[PDB]
Design a protein around this nucleic acid. Structure first.
Lengths: 125, 337, 185, 201
RNA sequence: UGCGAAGCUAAGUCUGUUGGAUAAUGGCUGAACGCCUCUUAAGCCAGAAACCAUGCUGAUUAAACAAUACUAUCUUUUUUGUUUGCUAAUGUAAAAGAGAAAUUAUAUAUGUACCGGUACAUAAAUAAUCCUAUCACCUUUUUCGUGAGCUGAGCUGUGAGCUAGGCAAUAGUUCUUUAACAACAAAAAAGAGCACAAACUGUAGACGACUUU
RNA sequence: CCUUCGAUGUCGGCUCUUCCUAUCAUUGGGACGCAGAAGUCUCAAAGUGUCGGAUUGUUCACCCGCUAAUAGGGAACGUGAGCUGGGUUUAGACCGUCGUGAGACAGGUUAGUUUUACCCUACUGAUGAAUUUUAUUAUAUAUAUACAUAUAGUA
RNA sequence: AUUUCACUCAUAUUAAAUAAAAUAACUCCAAGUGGGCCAUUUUUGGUAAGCAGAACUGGCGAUGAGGGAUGCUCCUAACGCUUGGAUAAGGUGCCUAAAUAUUCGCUCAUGAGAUCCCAUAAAAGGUGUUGGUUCAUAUGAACUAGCCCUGAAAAUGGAUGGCGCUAAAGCGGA
RNA sequence: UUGUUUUCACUUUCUCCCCGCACUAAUGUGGGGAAAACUGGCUUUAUUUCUUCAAUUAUUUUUUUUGCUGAGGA
């Protein structure tokens, strides 16, 4: 079912799962196109595991932005945040996972004085 | 394809499942159909199997190769001490079957009767039937009037007296004997008169009368298909043993049918056998219960040395023509035809 | 499908007729007969002061119209059976073995013996309102009489059919009880 | 459909049409109680329907008849089985619909004192041409092995006598109420009397 | 090797129903079709080792049920609530007036009164109907029906009314109208025995189970 | 030649059950070229029963005999983790015919290992809890109630 | 015959019509394939076959969706993800969304009948009923064809898909 | 070898008469006759809100209550 949050339409949630991954442990849920011969899912039999197709693609005006209507940009130190000085309204920042606590604090304070929102602002504290 | 040679199936499917009986006591599946003309009367009794003897009797069958000769017949002795009538149950007819309206009790019931309600009577304090026997006669008569008004089948709860027998068991056997006979009011009065007194075999039955016996057969545990259903033994060369049924079904249906004989419980089955004739009703009081007019010897029924595995028959008894299902000491229900 | 078709029956003199929702009661000096025609779509009109009964059928197809005359004949049979009792005269014929007839329970329950010398008793019970008696003029006769033609004729048929011959040539072993004639009293 | 429970007098109805109507009601969620099931009618002769039931009786799993089609002879159970066949009983919702139905032979204690309804689109009097054969479900059941027909009949005559007494009392009370009302109609103000007279009260 | 109780056991002994409704067939009355016709119309009869019952076996095959005996602190009204694994505590397959008991026939019924019949009424879109809803409060004039306590009977409460009077509602335009039923917890107020095991048994038995003391 | 050649154990008999009816006998009928007796044709009918042996691996057959009758069929040519292994159908060997020969032979003969269930289900017997959105063919001093009733343990 | 000069034969609708005709033509390199099968119509061998062999076209294969209960091939219709609308095939008593619709006939079956493929039925019969036709002084015949009946027997218990349906929920129409 | 022309036979009765004369499905009836003319049909005048003005088609113009949708940002 589609979900609408303002101008943001997500044509589908509950991402596609690999056929028979539910009942086989060696089959991981990551999607694989069933090549098969009599493959049910490949033949598009009713009531089973529909395949992804380009028709589900989201509107390209709102394709990559987060629930805050801003594109995510991942930063590793304070110097990667300079471009946002004049993109603060359309980009939000996210600190990379392997950034230590000092660089994290410095990034948070620099983003705050640049008034750029931070996604994972309360991590490692 | 078809069987090369036909032969009837092994055993009857009308006695299935050949499982152990629920109870030790024989249970009347159905009482004789009530005839409104006859005066009210009891239809059933309970005794205990004592053993078997044989008797000599003079045949009176014209045209029979025996006719005027004296033949020997096997007889079963059933020790029938008098029961006690203790209660009354009324049944009415509903589309769902017979429904009990109520059961009323006598004013006094024996400890032998109360014992049947206990698994551990010895260590209990025997409180059963202690405060419900002080009901006023007003409500007793009210219930009896309702039974007379609405009920169509009357039964009398009566119990045996095992203390009069050599049995080790002390708790009485209880059943209900259907009162067949006159109107509902006449049945009510007939059982009300003898609501607490003894019921001897003589009141229920007569000599030379054909009756039916209901009892549980002698048990044998699990038996093979050969001894349980009578199937034929396999030839001596059979690889994995010969005491079995070879083919237990065709390929299709891809199942075993319930009609195929298998191993399982044999004996301890409930059986109702018809037409056992009463040859003699021997009385406890008389000293020549086993005497005849051609014997004139003073002797009682108990064989010299006691009844094997049973004891001595010190009470009323009846001599039944033929054999009766069950072991010695087995409770045996006798029913009118 | 004809729009309306009727038939008229005349009521004789000493007969009282009551018809309610095609249930007919005919009373006469030989008793009362009843008959329900509620299995037929019929408009029955009884004229009492001018006698006669008219049975009319609206929108009758030939299959249903065939029953108008049947009902009328049944009514006239009730009339005649109530004014003069129906009487079936029966003869018991026999070749070598005479047939012994005994009539009991007030001219019902006729029992015959010695049918082909069988020395076994065959008895038939008369239908309600039917009497069986021996004729006073000719000996091998039997009178089956009563007010209801169905009951009387059925009793005659029962007497005839209770005495059939088995495992023989039926066209040579002719003995049995046969309806000789039908009349009234 | 919108009542808490509908009590249906099954006397004189045709079995299949009654079952269809009951099935739709139960699926839509209406609890119904079917009384006097022994008086249900089936089109076709008694012998023809008896042949149908014999064909049904000859039907059993030959490996184990206990598992087989349980045949059931009470006419109430015959109606219940027909309704179940008109129903998706193997689903949860279908099972709920099936269990919302109660069938009786005769009229037991609660249902003899409540209003009984009738379905016009299922009476024999409206659905069968008179010149055609039909059978009575109680008679068919008795020929098939029920043997409680006469008992239900005598219970019904007793119930009818009780009902007739009740009806006499009700008619007398209605007459008394009518007389009280017609006396009171002259004691209300003429405007109220005029309104009631105008609208038929 | 003889004999061999007991117990098992057949080769030994005992026992193994009668009703309904039908088929075939033969018939009854009887039109179609003036006659005839078992009906190849309506309406009936008799009828078979068949059928269905009866009788018998099971019935944790109905996850079925009844009557009885005895017993477990236990049992009834009001208020507030159910916002170490636990020790206060909530669920609806369906409240919104979930309103409605005569019986029957369908080519007719039902009531009444006399003796199935006769006569007279009633009903014939029958639920297309009827019944039930709002007049709050409080004060006064009072009338008629039910309950406590008192003695067929006085009084108080209650329900339904009559006369006259003056007294309220207000949340900004609706977001389910929180309205039913059943249960549960806390607190107040009133009253109210067995079974298993064990030992024994052997009518039982692979073990359970069963019969017993 | 459609399915099975990374195998569906291939004849018969024995054992055991069930089914069909196109009924052999038994039940009750109709017809006859039907006197009786016996019999033949035929209907409803599948409830009951359809056997002992000699020869042959045999099915079939064919005799002896009993019977009331010794009907015909199906169920993976019912039935091999049920047996048996006589036959067929490996490897030894013999004969006849065929072949130069190795060898062949719906030509005969003799000898030749028959595996596994403790799993699921079915079936047979044996213990056994739990069962409220569940059940009720009533319960109440000629009279109300489903807007109701119903605990649980033992017996 | 060729070559060069002349003159000029509709075109402003195009030397007949129509054309999502240039989505053309051509070249190069290369994959897979080279067991087919089915339906309609035609057709050979065969007693026949879900048999064997061919012709045309469409399919299945390679392909789901709605319907035909079910079904590789039948009918509708071919497929990005959605919201509304309206339909096809086929249905509207319940299962099952929609008619116990309306209107007119027929049919009673003691083994009724009930959606192409499709899940068998014939010769021969009937004084069942319903219409027609042609001969006979309202009769008798002889035909005809609708529905119904006989002909019509098989093996686990059973299948218009089930229930059931007869003032149809059957058959032929509207 | 087409037209044209002609004859009778076609209606309602809650009418009369006769026969059956109560016979009907009937508050009527069957059979056989006479009658005008209500009914029915036709012609002249006035009218269409007493009443009718239809149906189909072509060609036009509105209307009741309502479901879903709102791309874009010049």
């Amino acid at each position: 079912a589609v979900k609408k949050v303002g101008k943001i339409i997500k044509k589908r949630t509950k991402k596609f799962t690999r056929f028979q991954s539910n009942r086989f442990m060696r089959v991981k849920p990551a999607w694989r196109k069933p090549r098969g011969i009599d493959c049910r899912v490949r033949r598009r039999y009713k009531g089973t595991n529909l395949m992804p197709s380009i028709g589900y693609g989201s509107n390209k005006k709102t394709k990559f932005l987060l629930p805050n209507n801003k594109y995510k940009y991942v930063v590793k130190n304070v110097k990667e945040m300079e471009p946002l000085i004049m993109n603060h309204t359309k980009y939000c920042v996210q600190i990379a996972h392997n950034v230590s606590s000092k660089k994290r604090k410095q990034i948070i304070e620099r983003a705050k004085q640049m008034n750029v929102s931070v996604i994972n602002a309360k991590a490692r504290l | 394809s078809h069987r090369k040679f036909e032969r009837p199936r092994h055993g009857s499917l009308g006695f299935l499942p050949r499982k152990r009986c629920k109870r030790l006591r024989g249970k009347i599946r159905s009482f004789p159909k009530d005839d409104k003309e006859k005066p009210p009367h009891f239809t059933a009794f309970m005794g205990y199997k004592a053993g078997m003897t044989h008797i000599v009797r003079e045949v009176d069958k014209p045209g029979s190769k025996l006719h005027k000769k004296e033949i020997v017949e096997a007889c079963t002795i059933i020790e029938c001490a008098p029961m006690v009538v203790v209660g009354i149950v009324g049944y009415r007819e509903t589309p769902k079957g017979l429904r009990i309206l109520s059961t009323v009790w006598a004013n006094h019931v024996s400890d032998e009767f109360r014992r049947r309600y206990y698994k551990n009577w010895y260590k209990s304090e025997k409180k059963a039937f202690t405060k419900s026997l002080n009901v006023p006669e007003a409500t007793k008569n009210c219930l009896l009037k309702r039974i007379e008004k609405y009920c169509t089948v009357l039964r009398a709860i009566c119990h045996t007296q095992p203390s009069k027998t050599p049995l080790r068991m002390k708790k009485a056997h209880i059943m209900e004997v259907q009162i067949n006979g006159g109107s509902m009011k006449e049945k009510l009065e007939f059982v009300k008169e003898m609501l607490e007194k003894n019921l001897p075999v003589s009141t229920v039955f007569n000599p030379n009368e054909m009756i039916d016996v209901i009892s549980v057969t002698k048990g044998h545990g699990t038996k093979g298909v050969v001894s349980r259903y009578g199937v034929k033994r396999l030839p001596r060369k059979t690889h994995r043993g010969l005491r079995k049924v070879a083919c237990i079904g065709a390929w299709h249906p891809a199942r075993v049918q319930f009609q195929i004989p298998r191993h399982g419980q044999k004996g301890y089955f409930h059986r109702t056998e018809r037409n056992k004739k009463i040859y003699r009703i021997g009385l406890k009081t008389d000293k020549n219960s086993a005497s005849t007019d051609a014997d004139i010897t003073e002797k009682k029924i108990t064989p010299m040395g006691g009844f094997p595995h049973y004891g001595v028959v010190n009470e009323d008894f009846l001599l039944l023509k033929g054999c009766v299902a069950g072991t010695k000491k087995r409770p045996i229900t006798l029913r009118k035809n | 499908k004809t729009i309306v078709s009727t038939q008229k029956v005349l009521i004789p003199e000493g007969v009282k007729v009551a018809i309610n929702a095609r249930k007919v009661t005919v009373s006469g000096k030989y008793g009362t007969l009843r008959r329900s025609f509620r299995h037929l779509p019929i408009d029955i009109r009884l004229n009492k002061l001018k006698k006669y009964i008219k049975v009319v059928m609206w929108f009758g197809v030939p299959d249903s119209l065939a029953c108008i005359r049947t009902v009328c004949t049944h009514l006239k049979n009730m009339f005649t059976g109530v004014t003069k009792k129906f009487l079936y005269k029966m003869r018991l014929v026999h070749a070598h073995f005479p047939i012994n007839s005994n009539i009991v329970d007030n001219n019902t329950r006729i029992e015959i013996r010695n049918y082909l010398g069988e020395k076994s008793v065959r008895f038939v019970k008369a239908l309600p309102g039917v009497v069986i008696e021996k004729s006073p003029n000719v000996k091998d006769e039997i009178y089956v009489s009563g007010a209801d033609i169905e009951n009387v004729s059925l009793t005659a048929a029962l007497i005839h059919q209770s005495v059939l011959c088995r495992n023989k040539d039926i066209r040579k072993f002719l003995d049995g009880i046969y309806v000789s004639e039908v009349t009234t009293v | 459909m919108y009542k808490k429970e509908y009590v249906i007098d099954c006397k004189g109805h045709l079995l299949g049409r009654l079952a269809s109507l009951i099935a739709k009601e139960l699926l839509n969620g209406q609890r119904i109680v079917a009384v006097r099931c022994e008086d249900i009618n089936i089109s076709g002769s008694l012998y023809r329907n008896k042949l149908k039931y014999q064909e049904f009786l000859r039907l059993r799993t030959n490996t184990n008849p206990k598992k087989g089609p349980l045949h059931l002879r009470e006419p109430s159970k015959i109606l219940w089985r027909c309704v179940r066949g008109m129903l998706p009983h193997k689903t949860y919702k279908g099972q709920l619909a099936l269990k919302k139905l109660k069938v009786c032979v005769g009229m037991p204690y609660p249902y003899d004192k409540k209003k009984k309804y009738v379905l016009p689109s299922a009476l024999r009097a409206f659905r069968l041409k008179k010149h055609r054969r039909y059978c009575r479900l109680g008679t068919l059941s008795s020929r098939v092995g029920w043997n409680y027909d006469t008992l239900v009949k005598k219970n019904e005559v007793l119930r009818k006598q009780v009902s007739k007494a009740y009806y006499k009392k009700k008619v007398n009370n209605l007459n008394e109420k009518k007389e009280i009302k017609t006396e009171a109609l002259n004691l209300i103000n003429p405007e109220q009397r005029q309104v009631l007279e105008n609208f038929g009260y």
